[PDB]
Amino acid sequence: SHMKFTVEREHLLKPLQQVSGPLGGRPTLPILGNLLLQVADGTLSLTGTDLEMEMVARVALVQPHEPGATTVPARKFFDICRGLPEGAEIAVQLEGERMLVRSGRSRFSLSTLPAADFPNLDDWQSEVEFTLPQATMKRLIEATQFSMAHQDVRYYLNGMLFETEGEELRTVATDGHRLAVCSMPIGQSLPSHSVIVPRKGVIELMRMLDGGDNPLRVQIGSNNIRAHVGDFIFTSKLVDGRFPDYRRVLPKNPDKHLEAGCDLLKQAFARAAILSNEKFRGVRLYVSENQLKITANNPEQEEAEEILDVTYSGAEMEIGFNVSYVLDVLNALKCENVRMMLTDSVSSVQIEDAASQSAAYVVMPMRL
C-alpha cells in the first residue's frame, strides 16, 4: 500500500485514545489488537473494534499524503505518539509489512496486518433517526448506567434500554434489584421504538461525549445503533432480546413520602455502611414523625446508628435496604433535596430529586 501521512501529535492523541476504547486487554486474535488506518480524499480514518462495536475517528490532512490503508498495534502506536514531545510532527509511511513512524530523530518500525483482514460490522439500514445535544445524551446515560446489570444471566439486562416516545428519549437500566429511568425532550416527533444497547457500548458512547456545542446524530436500525459527534462515529450491534417494563416496578399509590437533604442522607448511609454485613450490605431504616433512624449490624455484632431530622408525615415503618444501592442513587442525584416514596416494608421504593422529576430511581427492599 502507498499510505503516507504527516500530522501534528496534538491532532492525533484524542482520535487514538477514542478509537482504542473498544480494545480489550487480551485480544483473542492479533488483528483485534490493531487499529485500521486509512488515507483517502485528504482524510485519515482510524478504526478500533471488538467485533460487537466499532469506533471511527476522522482527521483532516493538510500536509502532503498518499492514499492507502494498513492495521497497526493500537497500544504501541498510541504510546509512541503520547511519548513524543508536545508539538511533535508525526510522519507515517509503509515499508513492506512494516509501518514507519518518524518524528525528529525518533524512528519506530511497527509490524502490520493487511487492512483487507480488518473485521467490518455488516451493512444495515437506519429505521429511526434523531439529533440531540451531547449534554442531553450524557445526562440520560450518566443518570442510569450504574443500574445496568454487569454479568446477569438475563443477558438483556447487561445493557441499557433506549426508548423513543412522542418528543422524548428515555433510558432504562436495571439489574433486577434496582432500576434507573431518565427521560429528556428532544424537540422532534419520534415513532415509538425501543432498543437495548450492550453495556460495553453504553460506556463507549458515554466516554465519546464531552458536552460541547456539537450535536449528536443517532441512527437506529433493526440490529444496530450509530452515534455521530464531530469527527467521531460509534456503531454497535444491539442486544437481541425483550427488555422488561419499567412501569410495573413504580410504586402504584405511595402513601408515605420522605424528604431529606441529599448530602446529609448520603453521609449517614456511608458511615452506617462501615458496620453493615460485607456481603449483603443491609441497613435498616426506621421512619417516624420527621425522623429517620438508620441502623447497620454485621456478623461480628458491631452496630452503627444514625439519626436524622427529615420531613416525614406518614405511619411509622421499618424497611431494609442494600446500602450500596441507596448510595449509588444518592451519588447519581446531584441535588440538594431528595424525595423517597414508600408503601410498606416489602414493596419497592421510588427515589428522586425533590425538585426535579427528570430521573427516577427504584430500589427493591431487603427483608428484615
Partner: peptide
C-alpha cells in the same frame, strides 16, 4: 434482597 417484579 427482594427481586423487582420484572
Amino acid at each position: 434482597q427482594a427481586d423487582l417484579x420484572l
